[PDB]
Symmetry: C3
Subunit: 253 residues, 3 copies
């Protein structure tokens, strides 16, 4: 995997993604080390691996090792799609865990369907990104990926929201708070695809890479601390032990 | 991923897989929304993602984006094997939860071993499909894949069947009714590989693709609706609630 | 996937890995059949699939169908990295199952992070192996992979060890027993990477493939029977039933 040449402006935006995800992961690891309940531990570990994998994929892209040449000649950062397949289910799992508790006590096949529809969304998106410009198959997969996105929206706004009301009041508030912010940020992703050089090409590759970088920092770092502070607040309102799970394990032995 | 040329008769068989898997997945999604028990919901979304993933892989193949050329020169539809790795464990998951209930509360290692033996089968079958024609590497991996196939057969007819009767008489009948149909349909897959153009070459790639298409429609759409109506009759027999899972969550969430 | 020829001395070491992983997997399947408790059955089939997948990857490498030509010109056995991504989490699953029991009823995200950090380690190690020799990118991913290794060592020596003490004295004794032997053997893998032909190049591709074979044989076959013997001894001290789980299912 010899490093590939990148435009200076594009590589600069990728290094902003590296430094952003690295710092956010370090702070998010603190929420892991200080988790007090299984719900707080699951949410913390999920968010941390979102940032940690995102740091790796931006390091791969910045080092010129996360892109290849499509058949039409464009440069597609496939590493971004590869890790999106793993980070975006962890984000959605956080929503489903908020709505159904940790460990998941009910409606597990709707959680698996959430992850499944999301993984399909990314994978069919990669195919649309690798399809040649101006081709019908490029937008057939775009509409296929958008249909998976619509089903993720439906599960978040329909079944999973119905179960949030069943779980509890504070779980319903946190879920609605986190599901709304996530849904607004994620909506801009197909907009960048449609207008970036992975689609209609209204703006070039550097702008496309920059917007994806800012969206990734928003959906992972900014939203992650937005969500992990709501988890911590819910765990405070729920009256959690003033003890980490590790400290509770040390005293139980 | 620019579309690669495909023989017209082969492309025609791929589209009948697209139309069949697309209509089957839409109908199966109704079984998901109508689910009333955890067992009914687990079985429903499993079959739905079986049909849904099969739709996309036949779409990819029909669009000329689901195959590559092996080093020996043949055209291999690798997309089929790629999604087979995910749709065939979901089918067997349905058998596992029919024998052990949903959620699976015991014998999880035998379910993971079932899924694992199945993934090894498809993955090693891909290597045999990409190995050269008339080589020994092809039939070693064909032999390895057949070994994992026998492991699947043993787990279905052995420990899982022994566990089905422990769950109950209704779960035993459903399991034995669906496992027999599934096992008869799945046996024809290695026969097609053996005689198709990714094996000995009794028939060409068009006939091979056609047989795989029909076998996929049978094992996924035909068997899927055969199976999922069995799990609905089981819930009806056991007195299932008059409310779906969503409607039950709406009652317990409304005020 | 047409086979690419290998050095006969290298292919010889690969075929001894096929023979070793096959022989261990057949015996380990006998432990699967004899499983008496859900804990004993979880460890058995986990260790079995470790040997089985290792048999297939050495078969793929021995047949000349599991290597790659990196951009810099070297030959990398990517099949080994591909299956490492699956077998190494199963090994740590055994330790995690030893510490928390089967099924895992608590601290599930610490097992997922254990698996997650181990996967990142093998994947970033593969990227390090494919990166050109004598380049900064290779050793950037080597350090990144080494950091994921230290996370694995931290979780094993940290929260999992504390949780093994909570599960019971027999599980804590078995956990420390298998965790120390696993940790010592795994430490030798980055040593072979650093000094082998996918690193500094102290020795060529033949010695690197031979050491990985010996290391895989030791960490999977030798350790696997060392671990599964402690698993059966643990359930033996627990007075485990003389019935297998399948025999219990037939009677019930
Ligand atoms: C951290 C990464 C995140 C939150 C990624 C989000 C990606 C999406 C919501 C996907 C968007 C796409 C479509 C719905 C259509 C095709 C193009 C994609 C993949 C950008
Ligand atoms: C929907 C797809 C299904 C049910 C796939 C079934 C595939 C098999 C049962 C596998 C067959 C193979 C062998 C047992 C040996 C090697 C060739 C294969 C992969 C066709
Ligand atoms: C059966 C296979 C086993 C136990 C593999 C273990 C592999 C490791 C502990 C990984 C070692 C690596 C590093 C820590 C840094 C980069 C090079 C690696 C991948 C060999
Ligand atoms: C270049 C040297 C620095 C290394 C770069 C980053 C290395 C990646 C390290 C892995 C972090 C994994 C932490 C997982 C612990 C989870 C805690 C838990 O689950 O309770
Ligand atoms: C420290 C945590 C690291 C997390 C995992 C790292 C994620 C990136 C991993 C490697 C992605 C490589 C993608 C390259 C695909 C082929 C394109 C090419 O290089 O030619
Ligand atoms: C290449 C396409 C990849 C798609 C990945 C799909 C991920 C799995 C899809 C959904 C599985 C849903 C099955 C429900 C599991 C219920 C668990 C149970 O109770 O048994
Ligand atoms: C050219 C445009 C083609 C349009 C194709 C439409 C794509 C539909 C995508 C699949 C949605 C599947 C997800 C359904 C939710 C699962 C239900 C559940 O888990 O409970
Ligand atoms: C946007 C959500 C609905 C999904 C619809 C899928 C495709 C239509 C959306 C954008 C495509 C833009 C117009 C391009 C059509 C083909 C013209 C071309 O080949 O360049
Ligand atoms: C042109 C591409 C876009 C076309 C619109 C596609 C619409 C598909 C949207 C998803 C439907 C999801 C319904 C799933 C029902 C789940 C049942 C449940 O478990 O509650
Ligand atoms: C949410 C998006 C808001 C609007 C953002 C618009 C961005 C426009 C930026 C400049 C357009 C041209 C981009 C220059 C990149 C050239 C690189 C290339 O073409 O390969
Ligand atoms: C609430 C969600 C917020 C999402 C933030 C990301 C959306 C807006 C992103 C920035 C728009 C402008 C992009 C920068 C263009 C200049 C890049 C360049 O061409 O050099
Ligand atoms: C580091 C770059 C950040 C880019 C913008 C981040 C996008 C916004 C992310 C979420 C922050 C929350 C925004 C406002 C919360 C409103 C609360 C509510 O919805 O009730
Ligand atoms: C089971 C439902 C089946 C649905 C009907 C499927 C119809 C398939 C028909 C042929 C597909 C097109 C074949 C490609 C030929 C293109 C050559 C040309 O147009 O010149
Ligand atoms: C959203 C509804 C449809 C679901 C689609 C998701 C299922 C799988 C999608 C397509 C898989 C494509 C894999 C083919 C890549 C082969 C590589 C190649 O030929 O170059
Ligand atoms: C007909 C040729 C046979 C070749 C034999 C060699 C191939 C072996 C293939 C995989 C064996 C899979 C074993 C899986 C059973 C697991 C046991 C369990 O989970 O309880
Ligand atoms: C205990 C093992 C039971 C299984 C027995 C079947 C194993 C078959 C072994 C492989 C035969 C491969 C033949 C390759 C011939 C190579 C000769 C050459 O060209 O150099
Ligand atoms: C080669 C096989 C092609 C398969 C495609 C045709 C689809 C199969 C049609 C329906 C199968 C229904 C199976 C069980 C019927 C249940 C109806 C009922 O309960 O009354
Ligand atoms: C051509 C591929 C699509 C095939 C569609 C097959 C349609 C099968 C529809 C369901 C018929 C069964 C009615 C629902 C279950 C009733 C049986 C029962 O509850 O006991
Ligand atoms: C160096 C070439 C070796 C050739 C193969 C050697 C085979 C014998 C090796 C040891 C296997 C021991 C298996 C233990 C049998 C357990 C039987 C029991 O008590 O249930
Ligand atoms: C019983 C067997 C179980 C193990 C199955 C897995 C065996 C190994 C799987 C595939 C290894 C493929 C290695 C990559 C091939 C590179 C050749 C190339 O395409 O250039
Ligand atoms: C090349 C990939 C081959 C397939 C990889 C997947 C194989 C996994 C096999 C199953 C081992 C799992 C053992 C069951 C442990 C669960 C019970 C527990 O966690 O306590
Ligand atoms: C290509 C990058 C590969 C990344 C490896 C896989 C990453 C897995 C990371 C950890 C999984 C998230 C842990 C969350 C625990 C949830 C369990 C629960 O429901 O309580
Ligand atoms: C120069 C220093 C290099 C350091 C490399 C990276 C070190 C990583 C070490 C392990 C990090 C583990 C973090 C886990 C947090 C606590 C987990 C818990 O017990 O809940
Ligand atoms: Cl990512
Ligand atoms: Cl499929
Ligand atoms: Cl391995």
């Amino acid at each position: 995997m010899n490093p590939r040449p990148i435009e200076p402006a594009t590589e600069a935006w990728l290094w902003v993604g590296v430094a952003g995800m690295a710092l956010a992961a370090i702070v998010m690891l603190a929420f892991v080390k200080r988790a007090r309940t299984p719900f707080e531990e699951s949410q913390a570990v999920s968010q941390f691996f979102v940032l940690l994998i995102a740091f790796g994929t931006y390091l791969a892209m910045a080092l010129g090792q996360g892109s290849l040449t499509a058949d039409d000649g464009r440069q597609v950062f496939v590493s971004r799609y590869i890790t999106w397949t793993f980070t975006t289910p962890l984000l959605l799992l956080g929503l489903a865990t908020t709505a159904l508790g940790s460990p998941i006590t009910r409606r597990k096949p709707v959680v698996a369907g959430l992850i499944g529809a999301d993984i399909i969304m990314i994978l069919t998106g990669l195919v649309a990104a690798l399809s040649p410009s101006g081709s019908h198959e490029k937008w057939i997969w775009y509409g296929v990926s958008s249909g998976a996105f619509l089903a993720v929206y439906y599960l978040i706004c329909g079944p999973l929201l119905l179960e949030a009301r069943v779980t509890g009041a504070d779980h319903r508030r946190l879920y609605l708070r986190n599901a709304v912010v996530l849904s607004v940020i994620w909506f801009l992703y197909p907009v960048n695809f449609l207008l970036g050089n992975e689609g209609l090409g209204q703006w070039g590759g550097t702008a496309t890479t920059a917007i994806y970088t800012l969206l990734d920092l928003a959906s992972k770092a900014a939203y992650g601390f937005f969500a992990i502070t709501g988890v911590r607040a819910l765990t405070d309102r729920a009256g959690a032990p003033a003890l980490t799970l590790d400290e509770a394990a040390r005293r139980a032995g």
